[PDB]
């Protein structure tokens, strides 16, 4: 472990989906070939060029193991839609299989369906408003709690998982940013309201492994 040029990087298995150069979405790298995103993020698509840079730790310093990639197909759930937070999931298969290293490298993602414990910090992660990549441990709130906390609108099904979350990301945090416990990959958000308000609102995240027989399908 040692290349004098390349430097390693915290977290690299994050994917900046980008719309005509400037970061549109966080996203993560799942296998060699395929970044795993939210729908809701090719929402508004500028019909403009969509790529995804790989290797980045800051988006506006030079680093010797930023890439960037072209995409091939972009497959959202099917039952993903706009006016829903249901399976808003999409996945990005690259224009050739990423090189990999110290700054490049795939998540394992959940796979077993069981919900992570509460209380248990999980880290999110992603580019804000961006410079270098932002995350924060988050705690795990129990469904119960987060069903009341959203106004008890049933809001949260079994595929869905909520952390705490404060305004400034409830607005101004990557809108497709992963939520990693335990060095796996467990939620993707489902947020992306850029309207900043006084309107404290708990973090959801779709849960992965909730989809497992989806992405195995997708990526096989």
Not at 33 to 55: F, M, P, R
Request: charged fraction near 20%; proline fraction near 6%; glycine fraction near 10%.
């Amino acid at each position: 472990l040692g290349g004098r040029e390349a430097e390693a990087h915290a977290r690299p298995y994050m994917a900046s989906v980008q719309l005509n150069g400037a970061h549109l979405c966080g996203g993560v790298l799942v296998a060699e070939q395929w970044v795993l995103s939210a729908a809701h993020c090719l929402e508004d698509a500028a019909d403009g060029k969509v790529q995804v840079l790989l290797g980045a730790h800051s988006l506006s310093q030079p680093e010797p193991s930023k890439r960037l990639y072209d995409v091939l197909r972009a497959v959202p759930h099917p039952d993903s839609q706009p006016d829903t937070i249901d399976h808003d999931l999409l996945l990005l298969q690259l224009s050739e299989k990423a090189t990999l290293g110290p700054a490049v490298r795939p998540l394992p993602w959940q796979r077993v369906d069981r919900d992570v414990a509460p209380g248990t910090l999980c880290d999110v992660a992603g580019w804000g408003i961006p410079d270098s990549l932002q995350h924060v441990l988050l705690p795990v709130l129990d469904r119960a709690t987060c069903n009341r906390r959203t106004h008890h609108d049933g809001a949260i099904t079994e595929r869905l998982m909520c952390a705490e979350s404060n305004r400034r990301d409830s607005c101004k945090g990557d809108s497709g940013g992963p939520l990693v416990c335990g060095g796996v990959l467990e939620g993707v958000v489902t947020s992306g309201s850029r309207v900043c308000g006084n309107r404290k609102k708990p973090g959801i995240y779709t849960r992965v492994a909730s989809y497992a027989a989806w992405i195995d399908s997708v990526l096989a």
